[PDB]
Amino acid sequence: GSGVPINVKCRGSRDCLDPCKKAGMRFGKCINSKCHCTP
Protein backbone atom coordinates (compact mmCIF):
# COMPACT_ATOMS: atom_id res chain seq x y z
CA GLY A 1 0.00 0.00 0.00
CA SER A 2 2.12 2.87 1.37
CA GLY A 3 5.62 1.37 0.61
CA VAL A 4 7.44 2.48 -2.54
CA PRO A 5 9.37 -0.14 -4.57
CA ILE A 6 12.82 0.73 -5.84
CA ASN A 7 14.85 -1.50 -8.11
CA VAL A 8 17.27 -2.68 -5.50
CA LYS A 9 17.62 -6.35 -4.39
CA CYS A 10 18.00 -7.32 -0.76
CA ARG A 11 18.57 -10.21 1.63
CA GLY A 12 17.02 -8.35 4.55
CA SER A 13 15.61 -4.97 5.40
CA ARG A 14 19.15 -3.55 6.44
CA ASP A 15 20.19 -3.75 2.79
CA CYS A 16 17.40 -1.27 2.00
CA LEU A 17 18.39 1.46 4.43
CA ASP A 18 21.10 3.31 2.45
CA PRO A 19 19.33 3.09 -0.92
CA CYS A 20 15.97 4.16 0.51
CA LYS A 21 17.62 7.16 2.19
CA LYS A 22 19.39 8.11 -1.07
CA ALA A 23 16.08 7.88 -2.90
CA GLY A 24 14.64 10.55 -0.57
CA MET A 25 12.82 8.25 1.82
CA ARG A 26 13.01 7.34 5.53
CA PHE A 27 14.10 3.67 5.49
CA GLY A 28 13.11 0.44 3.73
CA LYS A 29 11.68 -3.06 4.05
CA CYS A 30 12.93 -6.01 2.04
CA ILE A 31 9.85 -7.64 0.44
CA ASN A 32 10.41 -10.80 -1.64
CA SER A 33 14.06 -9.76 -1.97
CA LYS A 34 13.28 -6.25 -3.27
CA CYS A 35 13.42 -2.93 -1.37
CA HIS A 36 10.20 -1.12 -0.64
CA CYS A 37 10.89 2.28 0.91
CA THR A 38 8.82 4.04 3.57
CA PRO A 39 8.34 7.65 2.50
Curated annotation (Swiss-Prot):
- Into which family does the record put it? Belongs to the short scorpion toxin superfamily. Potassium channel inhibitor family. Alpha-KTx 03 subfamily.
Task: Alphabetically list the UniProt keywords.
Answer: Disulfide bond, Ion channel impairing toxin, Neurotoxin, Potassium channel impairing toxin, Secreted, Signal, Toxin, Voltage-gated potassium channel impairing toxin
What's noted about domains in the record?
Has the structural arrangement of an alpha-helix connected to antiparallel beta-sheets by disulfide bonds (CS-alpha/beta).
Q: List the disulfide bonds.
A: 10-30, 16-35, 20-37
User: According to its UniProt record, in which tissues is this protein expressed?
Assistant: Expressed by the venom gland.
GO MF annotation: an example: potassium channel regulator activity
Predominant place of localization: secreted
Other remarks in the entry: Negative results: does not affect mammalian potassium channels (Kv2.1/KCNB1, Kir1.1/KCNJ1, Kv3.4/KCNC4, Kv4.2/KCND2, Kv7.1/KCNQ1, Kv7.2/KCNQ2, Kv7.3/KCNQ3 and Kv11.1/KCNH2). Also weakly inhibits Kv11.1/KCNH2/ERG1, Kv1.2/KCNA2 and Nav1.7/SCN9A channels.
**Name of the protein:** Potassium channel toxin alpha-KTx 3.10
